[PDB]
Amino acid sequence: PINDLRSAIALLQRHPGHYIETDHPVDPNAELAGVYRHIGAGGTVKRPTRTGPAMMFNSVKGYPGSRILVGMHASRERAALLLGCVPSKLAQHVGQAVKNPVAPVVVPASQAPCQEQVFYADDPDFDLRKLLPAPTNTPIDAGPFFCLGLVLASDPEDTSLTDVTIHRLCVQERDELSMFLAAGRHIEVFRKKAEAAGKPLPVTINMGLDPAIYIGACFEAPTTPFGYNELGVAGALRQQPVELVQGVAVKEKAIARAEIIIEGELLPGVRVREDQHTNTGHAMPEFPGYCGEANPSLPVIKVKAVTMRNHAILQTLVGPGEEHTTLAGLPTEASIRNAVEEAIPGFLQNVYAHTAGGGKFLGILQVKKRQPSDEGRQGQAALIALATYSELKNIILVDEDVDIFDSDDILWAMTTRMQGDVSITTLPGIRGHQLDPSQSPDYSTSIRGNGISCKTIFDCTVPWALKARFERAPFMEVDPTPWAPELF
Amino acid sequence: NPINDLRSAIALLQRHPGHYIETDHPVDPNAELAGVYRHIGAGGTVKRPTRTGPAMMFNSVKGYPGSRILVGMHASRERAALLLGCVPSKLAQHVGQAVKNPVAPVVVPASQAPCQEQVFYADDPDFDLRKLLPAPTNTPIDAGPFFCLGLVLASDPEDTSLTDVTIHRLCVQERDELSMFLAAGRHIEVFRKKAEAAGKPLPVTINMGLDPAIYIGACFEAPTTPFGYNELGVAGALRQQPVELVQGVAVKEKAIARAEIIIEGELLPGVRVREDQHTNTGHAMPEFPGYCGEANPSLPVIKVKAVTMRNHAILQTLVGPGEEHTTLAGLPTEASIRNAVEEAIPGFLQNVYAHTAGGGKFLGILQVKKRQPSDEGRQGQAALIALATYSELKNIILVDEDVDIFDSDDILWAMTTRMQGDVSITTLPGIRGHQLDPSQSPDYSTSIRGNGISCKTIFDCTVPWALKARFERAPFMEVDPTPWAPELF
């Protein structure tokens, strides 16, 4: 079975094409990301690019004994393989585990591989910049970045309330990182509580994990006493609870079977400019495919210790490309699937949070009109999708005979099953997302501020009265394996 | 002093003058009855002149001595709020709070079942439902006499632990037969299909004359628990006292113990009737949008086995259905819309009104408060959530927190001074709405592909965030005007 990063790699090695290694040296500064751009970054990264194998870089220039791993989640086919289900049913699969979680468990340090090696910060030869090779994606980033930091944090007033989230961090000093916290998230509430009292907030950055943890943590989870409830998804996906170990130097727990763990605390009453040492004005590439701007006021994490297993694998991403599409798009598809199935049972067939929108901006809904009254319900499904995921932008509606994962087949529906003065409904002035650069008053007079957009529903479904005229050419059902065994 | 039935609720209304009256003037239950209350308290989408007023008891029914007919009990938001102990603006919240912590019903012996103080078995050859109950007709073109507030209890004919309680309307067809429509996809309809498949009837009880808490709570979405009857849990929570149930006398189903009248019958398999078979008016009844509905051609028949009522049983129904429908339908509408927006955008939606001009279903008024620049653009998000939550909505109007969403004058004011027709109006064609809107027809629009499909419109009458400083309503000094006119307060 799988219970950490390395056992997942073993499964990938039994399916050739999903994992490779290389011993040719590489620079973690921009060179690594530039290489994986051609191999497996995918997503919204500039062409040429493609989905490919997960990649391991064994020779890291300037970091002997370190190995960097990227693209673990940069493939919907790979992600379904890691959880054991069909790719088209992957969101439905994880959504089922969301509804029947398996709570994590605390285990002693003897069962925590993540603490085989310990490095305290108060040691005078400790330097976070020499201990870990944090890669940069572009030569214009704010600095070195960790992009897959599973952050654990508890309320300082009541430890029974926790939060499990994925963050990115920029290495600033030998013992400091900058970390943005989304306003409204529980951990940001926890941090403002501690900063209001002048106290730091202990946290753990857990990196190099079972893919089931990274994916499952992106879903919304209920709350239970001493919860860490986001981990319950991975517990249900593996039918084995996720094990936790007490931190070595902070009053917070950590993933026991993690590759690397940074223990630190959010400092009270201190901010930092994200690119203070590079002065590029930017932070790093964002999921829409453009370079985000450097945040001028970020809170600082003061590192206390770094614990890692022997021959620790540093896991991060590149792009963020298809990797971000997987981690954000599966929750997007799941919450839309639940909302529509609740409102219109048996109508929605599937949903794809398209990788062209990073799994956030573009939603493709596949419906099936079973009866005359289903005409008019496709627009209802699009309204439900927009209402469930406010950060969406455009919705495309197609029938069950369209493959929503094939963008050629989507454009085909836009071509032969659509009239621009009939099938296109615009919705101006709806709050969308700040990182879409076209959501600007400079782009449209109907946009009153940044992050507001026009939202468009493309109804490429066949009108119920005409479905007999739109049957695709019916080729005979055959098994092509005998005529070309090598292709199957 | 507490409320546990219809008569204890009437007693509370009598302590608040203006909400209940009686009359001893003889009234004809055929048309004349509804025609009178149209002027007095029908309200809603009833054709003018009309208004909301007191609930009304007609003690003198022509041809029915000893009968007394009750209408208008829920025909007022103030009256409903008083009947539940809260302010009318927070009425949807107060019930939604009780929905989340229901109190389960309890079965009791016939000793504690006032509803069974009288029993009329249908096997008597002189039995006649027409002689027994004076079911009124709302208009002269109705399909026949109607019961409009029948709380129906039913259970799965296979797994009796699965129950469903709902509100239906029933048309009197014979001395022992009623026609009753059932909405597809609901549990009681699925229960009837299983029974009809095996050639077996389905036992039901029709409970009429209830605590308003029961009628109101039954319209909300309830969970399902073993032998739960969960829609009754809202009323039990609203009274902090469980609803009492009594085993049926002639059929295999329980009934409301504190009810005024009970009809015990069975849904006969295979048999079908058209609603207007005895009248041929082509119509059924006035519907909530304000028009007379068409007669249903194929309706399942309820064969009554026993009628059960207390001494001097009050016959409760509605007229219009007017404001009475707006209350029963609009409170669930507002509650679910409020829950959906508060989850998605906390602290943004201030209130919501399922406007009575929409019958509590077609028109939604949303009161939002823009607190920060990021709130600009979320008002349309709030409208999309409501449309997604209640698909039978047609139009949405967005207003700010300084607009009284229950004052239609104030709504048209926001639509006059806080709106530009080429900026603030978003049309959404081809969205299924509701069959009873007559404009949802291909004959009304070329963008409508079939009956029940509509264009849905969002009127954004909120002040743009950047201009809010220019749209402050005139600030009048806050005073307590009681000493200057104590008779008005």
> Which amino acid does the sequence have at A301?
I
Residues 6+ positions from A157 with CB-CB distance below 8 Å: A193
Q: Is the dihedral of CA A161, A164, A165, A167 positive or negative?
A: positive
Residue of chain A nearest B376, judged by CA positions: A431
Residues 6+ positions from B144 with CB-CB distance below 8 Å: B137, B171, B172, B173, B275, B276, B278, B279
Instruction: Please give the C-alpha separations between residue B14 and each of B5, B36, B324, in angstroms, as whole numbers.
Output: 15, 21, 19
Q: How far apart are CA A168 and CA A95, in angstroms?
A: 25
Identify the experimental approach. X-ray
Please give the angle made by the CA atoms of A109, A111 and A115, to the nearest 5 degrees.
50
DSSP assignment string, A170-226 = EEEETTEEEE---TTSHHHHHHHHHHHTT--EEEEEEES--HHHHHHHTS-----TT
Q: Which two tokens stand for residue A188?
A: 């940001």
Cis peptide preceding B297, ω within 30 of 0: no
> Which amino acid does the sequence have at B296?
N
Task: List beta partners, residue B292.
Answer: B286
Residue B190 contacts A where some CB pair is shorter than 8 Å: no
Q: How far apart are CA A61 and CA A59, in angstroms?
A: 6
> Which amino acid does the sequence have at A429?
G
Give all strands of the β-sheet with B314-317 in edge-to-edge order.
B20-23, B55-58, B68-71, B314-317
Residue B424 contacts A where some CB pair is shorter than 8 Å: no
Residue B464 contacts A where some CB pair is shorter than 8 Å: yes
From the list A252, A263, A286, A323, the catalytic residue is: A286
Beta carbons of B356 and B330 less than 8 angstroms apart: yes
How near does any CA of chain B get to the CA of A182, in Å? Answer: 14
How near does any CA of chain A get to the CA of B161, in Å? Answer: 23
Please give the angle made by the CA atoms of B130, B136 and B137, to the nearest 5 degrees.
115
Helices (H) then strands (E): counts for chain B: 11, 21
Q: How far apart are CA A258 and CA A210, in angstroms?
A: 8
SS3 B352: strand
Q: Which two tokens stand for residue A5?
A: 């990063």
Q: How far apart are CA B177 and CA B171, in angstroms?
A: 9
Backbone angles phi, psi at A123, to 5 degrees: -60, 135
Instruction: Please give the C-alpha separations between residue B92 and each of B303, B326, B336, B357, B367, in angstroms, as whole numbers.
Output: 37, 12, 9, 18, 14
* A–B CB contacts, 8 A cutoff, strictly below: 88
- Could B391 and A343 be called an inter-chain contact, meaning their C-beta atoms sit closer than 8 Å? yes
Instruction: Please give the C-alpha separations between residue B144 and each of B169, B170, B173, B221, in angstroms, as whole numbers.
Output: 12, 10, 7, 31
How near does any CA of chain A get to the CA of B387, in Å? Answer: 7
- Could A388 and B389 be called an inter-chain contact, meaning their C-beta atoms sit closer than 8 Å? no
- Could B380 and A451 be called an inter-chain contact, meaning their C-beta atoms sit closer than 8 Å? no
Residue A464 contacts B where some CB pair is shorter than 8 Å: yes
Q: How many C-beta neighbours within 10 Å does residue B175 have? A: 15
Q: Is B476 left (phi over 0), alpha (psi -120 to 50) or beta?
A: beta
Please indicate if the annotation marks A220 as binding a ligand.
Answer: yes
Helix (H) or strand (E) holding A165: strand A162-173
Residue B485 contacts A where some CB pair is shorter than 8 Å: no
Instruction: Please give the C-alpha separations between residue A224 and each of A280, B299, B410, B472, in angstroms, as whole numbers.
Output: 43, 49, 45, 45
- Could A387 and B388 be called an inter-chain contact, meaning their C-beta atoms sit closer than 8 Å? yes
Residue of chain A nearest B457, judged by CA positions: A427
Beta carbons of B360 and B327 less than 8 angstroms apart: yes
How near does any CA of chain B get to the CA of A272, in Å? Answer: 24
Q: How far apart are CA A413 and CA A369, in angstroms?
A: 16
Comparing CA positions, the residue from A105, A80, A103, A99 lying closest to residue A90 is: A80
Q: How many C-beta neighbours within 10 Å does residue A114 have? A: 28
Mutation site, A390, A424, A446, A450, interface B, largest B CB count within 10 A: A390
Beta carbons of B354 and B361 less than 8 angstroms apart: yes
Please indicate if the annotation marks A273 as binding a ligand.
Answer: no
Instruction: Please give the C-alpha separations between residue B255 and each of A101, A221, B72, B108, B167, in angstroms, as whole numbers.
Output: 40, 41, 23, 10, 14
Breaks (C-N over 2.5 A) in chain A follow: none
Q: How far apart are CA B393 and CA B405, in angstroms?
A: 17
A286 tagged catalytic: yes
CB nearest A430 (choices: B380, B449, B453): B380
> Which amino acid does the sequence have at B241?
Q
Beta carbons of B449 and A465 less than 8 angstroms apart: yes
Beta carbons of A178 and A272 less than 8 angstroms apart: yes
Q: Which two tokens stand for residue A60?
A: 């890291």
- Could B376 and A448 be called an inter-chain contact, meaning their C-beta atoms sit closer than 8 Å? yes
> Which residues of chain A lie closer than 8 angstroms to B340, CB-CB?
387
Torsion of the alpha carbons at A229, B101, B368 and B76, rounded to the nearest 10: 170
Mutation site, B371, B374, B390, B454, interface A, largest A CB count within 10 A: B374
Residue A448 contacts B where some CB pair is shorter than 8 Å: yes
Mutation site, B394, B432, B446, B455, interface A, largest A CB count within 10 A: B432
- Could A343 and B450 be called an inter-chain contact, meaning their C-beta atoms sit closer than 8 Å? no
Comparing CA positions, the residue from A28, A69, A264, A252 lying closest to residue A169 is: A264
Torsion of the alpha carbons at A55, A57, A58 and A64, rounded to the nearest 10: -150
Q: How far apart are CA A454 and CA A399, in angstroms?
A: 25
Beta carbons of A168 and A149 less than 8 angstroms apart: yes
> Which amino acid does the sequence have at B462?
T
- Could B380 and A425 be called an inter-chain contact, meaning their C-beta atoms sit closer than 8 Å? no
Beta carbons of B43 and B83 less than 8 angstroms apart: no
Q: How many C-beta neighbours within 10 Å does residue B270 have? A: 9
Question: Could you tell me whether strands A105-106 and A117-120 are parallel, antiparallel, or unpaired per DSSP bridges?
Answer: unpaired
Residue A427 contacts B where some CB pair is shorter than 8 Å: yes
Residues 6+ positions from A472 with CB-CB distance below 8 Å: A401
Beta carbons of B151 and B187 less than 8 angstroms apart: no
DSSP assignment string, B2-71 = ---SHHHHHHHHHTSTTSEEEE-S-B-TBTHHHHHHHHHT--TTSPSS-----EEEE--BTTBTT-EEEE
> Which residues of chain B lie closer than 8 angstroms to A388, CB-CB?
388
> Which amino acid does the sequence have at B382?
A
Residue B339 contacts A where some CB pair is shorter than 8 Å: no
Please indicate if the annotation marks B167 as binding a ligand.
Answer: yes
**A178-198 as b/e, with b when 16 or more CB fall inside 10 Å?**
bbbbeeeebbbebbbebbeee
Residue A452 contacts B where some CB pair is shorter than 8 Å: yes
Beta carbons of B293 and B283 less than 8 angstroms apart: yes
Q: How many C-beta neighbours within 10 Å does residue A478 have? A: 8
Q: Which two tokens stand for residue A32?
A: 């690594």
Torsion of the alpha carbons at A159, A160, A165 and A167, rounded to the nearest 10: 0
Residues 6+ positions from B470 with CB-CB distance below 8 Å: none
SS3 A468: helix
How near does any CA of chain B get to the CA of A129, in Å? Answer: 38
Is A314 buried (19+), middle (13-18) or exposed (0-12) by CB count in 10 A?
Answer: buried
Q: How far apart are CA B4 and CA A441, in angstroms?
A: 59
Q: How far apart are CA A383 and CA A330, in angstroms?
A: 19
> Which amino acid does the sequence have at B289?
P
Torsion of the alpha carbons at B222, B224, B227 and B230, rounded to the nearest 10: -10
Instruction: Please give the C-alpha separations between residue A213 and each of A103, A165, A228, A252, A315, in angstroms, as whole numbers.
Output: 12, 10, 11, 18, 13
Question: Could you tell me whether strands A201-207 and B425-432 are parallel, antiparallel, or unpaired per DSSP bridges?
Answer: unpaired
SS3 B72: coil
Q: Which two tokens stand for residue B133?
A: 């109950």
Q: How far apart are CA B95 and CA B88, in angstroms?
A: 11
Residues 6+ positions from B270 with CB-CB distance below 8 Å: B196, B199
How near does any CA of chain B get to the CA of A377, in Å? Answer: 6
Q: How far apart are CA A170 and CA A192, in angstroms?
A: 21
Q: How far apart are CA A204 and CA A263, in angstroms?
A: 5
Comparing CA positions, the residue from A298, A413, A317 lying closest to residue A358 is: A317
Question: Could you tell me whether strands A105-106 and A243-246 are parallel, antiparallel, or unpaired per DSSP bridges?
Answer: parallel
Q: How far apart are CA B198 and CA A254, in angstroms?
A: 60
> Which residues of chain B lie closer than 8 angstroms to A431, CB-CB?
374, 376-378, 380-381
> Which amino acid does the sequence have at A164?
V
Instruction: Please give the C-alpha separations between residue A215 and each of A232, A333, A416, in angstroms, as whole numbers.
Output: 11, 13, 37
SS3 B469: helix
Residue B449 contacts A where some CB pair is shorter than 8 Å: yes
